[PDB]
Design a protein around this nucleic acid. Sequence first.
RNA 1: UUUGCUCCACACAAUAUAGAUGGAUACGAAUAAGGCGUCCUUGUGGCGUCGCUGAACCAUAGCAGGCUAGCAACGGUGCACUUGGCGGAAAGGCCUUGGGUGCUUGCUGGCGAAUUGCAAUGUCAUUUUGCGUGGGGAUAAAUCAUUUGUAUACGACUUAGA
RNA 2: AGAACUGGCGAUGCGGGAUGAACCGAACGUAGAGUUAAGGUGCCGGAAUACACGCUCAUCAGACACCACAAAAGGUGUUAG
RNA 3: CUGGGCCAGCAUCAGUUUUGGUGGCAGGAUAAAUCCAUAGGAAUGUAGCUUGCCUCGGUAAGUAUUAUAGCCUGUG
Lengths: 197, 137, 172, 106, 51, 98
Amino acid sequence: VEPVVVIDGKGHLVGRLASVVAKQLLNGQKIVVVRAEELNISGEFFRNKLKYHDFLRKATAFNKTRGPFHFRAPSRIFYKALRGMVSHKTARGKAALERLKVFEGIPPPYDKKKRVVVPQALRVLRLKPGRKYTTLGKLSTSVGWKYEDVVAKLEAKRKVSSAEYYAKKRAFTKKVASANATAAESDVAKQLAALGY
Amino acid sequence: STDSIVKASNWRLVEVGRVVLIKKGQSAGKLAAIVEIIDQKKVLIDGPKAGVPRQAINLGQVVLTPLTFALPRGARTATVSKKWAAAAVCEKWAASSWAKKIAQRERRAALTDFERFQVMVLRKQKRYTVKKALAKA
Amino acid sequence: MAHFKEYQVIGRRLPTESVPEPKLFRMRIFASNEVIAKSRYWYFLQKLHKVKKASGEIVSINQINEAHPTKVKNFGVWVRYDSRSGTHNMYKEIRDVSRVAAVETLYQDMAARHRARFRSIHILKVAEIEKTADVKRQYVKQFLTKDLKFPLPHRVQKSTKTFSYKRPSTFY
Amino acid sequence: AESHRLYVKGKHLSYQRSKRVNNPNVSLIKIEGVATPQDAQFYLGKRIAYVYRASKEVRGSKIRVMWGKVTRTHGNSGVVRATFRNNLPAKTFGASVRIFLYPSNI
Amino acid sequence: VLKKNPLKNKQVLLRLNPYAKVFAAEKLGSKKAEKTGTKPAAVFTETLKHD
Amino acid sequence: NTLLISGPFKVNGVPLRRVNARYVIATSTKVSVEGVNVEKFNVEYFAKEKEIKAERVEDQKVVDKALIAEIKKTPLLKQYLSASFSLKNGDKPHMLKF
RNA sequence: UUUGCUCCACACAAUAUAGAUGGAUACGAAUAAGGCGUCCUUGUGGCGUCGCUGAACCAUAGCAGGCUAGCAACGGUGCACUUGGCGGAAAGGCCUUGGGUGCUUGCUGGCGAAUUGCAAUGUCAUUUUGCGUGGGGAUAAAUCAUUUGUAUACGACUUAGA
RNA sequence: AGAACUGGCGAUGCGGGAUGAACCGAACGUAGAGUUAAGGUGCCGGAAUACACGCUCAUCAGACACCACAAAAGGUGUUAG
RNA sequence: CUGGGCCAGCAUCAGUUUUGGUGGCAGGAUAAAUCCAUAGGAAUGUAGCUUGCCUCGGUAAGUAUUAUAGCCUGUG
Ligand SMILES: [Mg+2]
Ligand SMILES: [Mg+2]
Ligand SMILES: [Mg+2]
Ligand SMILES: [Mg+2]
Ligand SMILES: [Mg+2]
Ligand SMILES: [Mg+2]
Ligand SMILES: [Mg+2]
Ligand SMILES: [Mg+2]
Ligand SMILES: [Mg+2]
Ligand SMILES: [Mg+2]
Ligand SMILES: [Mg+2]
Ligand SMILES: [Mg+2]
Ligand SMILES: [Mg+2]
Ligand SMILES: [Mg+2]
Ligand SMILES: [Mg+2]
Ligand SMILES: [Mg+2]
Ligand SMILES: [Mg+2]
Ligand SMILES: [Mg+2]
Ligand SMILES: [Mg+2]
Ligand SMILES: [Mg+2]
Ligand SMILES: [Mg+2]
Ligand SMILES: [Mg+2]
Ligand SMILES: [Mg+2]
Ligand SMILES: [Mg+2]
Ligand SMILES: [Mg+2]
Ligand SMILES: [Mg+2]
Ligand SMILES: [Mg+2]
Ligand SMILES: [Mg+2]
Ligand SMILES: [Mg+2]
Ligand SMILES: [Mg+2]
Ligand SMILES: [Mg+2]
């Protein structure tokens, strides 16, 4: 129902966004997730830092290379939650996951593309108020992610541009209004109104 | 401007006479009026004009509208009716863009294929003169 | 245990030699159907008198509908209930529009707060509180003020579709 | 006419299956726009078609079609069941499928 | 060779038990009771609404 | 069991033709058909005896001229009748009207 | 080495495809608050308005969309051109100038459709890879062997030789 | 380690309990359509991110019979009594 | 080139089934309510009244049970 679906990762809860994203792929939907750094996890920071550190302390004892890999950046923290919900060792699964793309900050193509939200994974809608939660970027930087600063830099810089863009656009529709009026209550106007339009 | 400025957040209140849009069920889409408060999540509503039977309702399955009128707590249906009429509630309702959007929504849903076709031909005609206007100023 | 109903259950010991026509007893019973109602009659009747149903009969079952089902009222509820370590008496208030409603939430409450399942709870007495400010428990009393009104902050509209093209608002 | 389409767009989700044993004989289908058993009743009986390509051209065309029909509803969420003349490939899980308006009863 | 059910297939319904013919014809799957006026004694309803 | 159909031909290329009832969405809209003969057409009429008869081509014109007469009465019925039906994006047939 | 070699147009035989079939339609942010409009002290400001879903918006008529005559615009859109700019997060895209040109369903005409016989089976999308035309374009190294010992079990490494 | 009655395993696959002799459900000719059981329906995974009232925030929360343990003792956490 | 063989669509049926729409009856406190009538009555006390305060708009207490809102209980 859209060739590709860009999701603004922001304000979403990992596991729930993960669960919805993962079923989309299995059904043939191409999903690309942006701004993973501004993604949430229920529970206060210290907790989820504690958790990640438990993930951290596991590794093939005889060869730390073989053992579980500990990706740190948000996009891949999220890819983990996601992959855990796909049958990723099967052909089908590998295919599913190849319909997915996960970035931190929103980086070209999609810079100018519309992103959406997933209400049923929207932290604000979801978490009870007062309940402590975690921002994924802070967690990541905390366990080794190197690039929060840079993403912040590039993101701000982009938000600048995107503003002048929207401001232009918000003004174009001003112009579209000036000429909307002249026709707004013309005759076909009242006529289209008859049929719900 | 040296005043104390406090953004006074302005909620729809659950109160006697607060009128509500019923969301789900046998009386879905109809307007009722809150008559008395049961508890923090339950109320006693009644919508005589709309044909919604006086009942306890779960505040969940009803949406509070901004419309509120004058009604004495616990009023029986009969006077609930008398006051709603007096209040010109229905009138105010149908005047809201909330109401009209519902009806537009309703109208499109009703269009027959041929009708639908015409809407296109007229949308086409109105766009011509609009793109025109647009390209002039 | 479902949608509750109240039943007048009337029964008597079976008739005999010495007592042609024995004394009729009645209970009000909140059960969800007749078969349970009559069984819960015989449960108590074993514990109060020493009748077994084998030697008795059920003279009538009648459903006691609520008188004024669309009049909000404040019920007082007296409960005997069993816990993991003892058995206790309670009193609580429930504001509702009918007796049968009151009981449902009583039974839910006993179950949420004290983990008491239906079996571990006798309903002693349920009675409308005629004079307001005979209302004893605050969680009801705070609904009894003049010109009561409250808001319902942070409203979470359930979405139909899975993606939405606007960041939602919680603004009731 | 930018559009030419007279079918409703659909996905091929799965075979009928338990937790650990599948049934290739029935196929579960997700019909775009349909969200409830109530709704999905409308498309019962209708003709499904999976359309695929191939190298070895047969009928002058290198396009082939697997036909079958919607047979009953599934679950609570507009999902629906289908038998095809020959069970669908299974590589097709997540592929698009076509749900037609005939046999029409409108 | 094939058990036909009488609750569908009116024919085999009619083979077993006729009267169905008159039953249907005379409605009486409906049919109203005749009204009466028996009102319950005061003691009856005192006890209903008792305690 | 089939439905005699006509278009009309001059309106959108469709002939007086047979079509199965189960492959047609009957719409809500309707044109009067009182003044149209429609008697001579039957099974045998269509019975395949490449090269179209001069009868068929004539009958078409007879039937059509009346229909196009009645069609033209109402605005855009003719133009509608010429345009082809197709499901647009997010048409939900299972509750569209027609 | 004797085939050459690379780049732009469309051309032909194979080849493959996790699955086109009107449009992936760009603020940021808050959610016990905000969007849009409008004014101003340009701000924790004034007034108005909106939500209760994208059930939107845009596009959608024409042999799978033919041929043909005009009217009213001077708009729309597509294709190659052209004037400026902007984009490095993977910018490989965006805005803009001036014409040209196909179409234009904003509107009014003149034709065409059948017999594909009552559904099957009827738009063809893009990957590669070989050859083919003609146009532009470029005219190298690597390995073996030999040699150094900053290297070395063998390969490998590091040097050197017209 | 050793008896009692019954039901099992052994000799028996099948659906459930991830896993598994013995639990739950249910016993088996080749198949079609339907309905179920025990058990489940965020995603892995077929099936409501269903409805409703409460309770709970754990810098060691918790999450389902058999079953993969926890006690005496204590808390001005919080809820009801 | 028709007839076979096979495959398919539609129609009318039979057997098994699943999912809707709609018609007529029965029972109960011959549902309970609403509604109507009447009796009584209270407060989260409607109107008036009294009273300081007042921007003379109205306010706050006191009185007063329908009045310039209404509600509750019984009976019919
Ligand atoms: Mg979370
Ligand atoms: Mg982790
Ligand atoms: Mg380590
Ligand atoms: Mg597996
Ligand atoms: Mg940038
Ligand atoms: Mg005990
Ligand atoms: Mg007990
Ligand atoms: Mg299945
Ligand atoms: Mg478009
Ligand atoms: Mg505002
Ligand atoms: Mg829009
Ligand atoms: Mg034309
Ligand atoms: Mg034409
Ligand atoms: Mg053609
Ligand atoms: Mg002209
Ligand atoms: Mg030309
Ligand atoms: Mg077909
Ligand atoms: Mg040496
Ligand atoms: Mg046993
Ligand atoms: Mg042995
Ligand atoms: Mg066994
Ligand atoms: Mg286990
Ligand atoms: Mg047992
Ligand atoms: Mg898994
Ligand atoms: Mg599922
Ligand atoms: Mg804490
Ligand atoms: Mg136990
Ligand atoms: Mg305690
Ligand atoms: Mg032949
Ligand atoms: Mg049948
Ligand atoms: Mg009255």
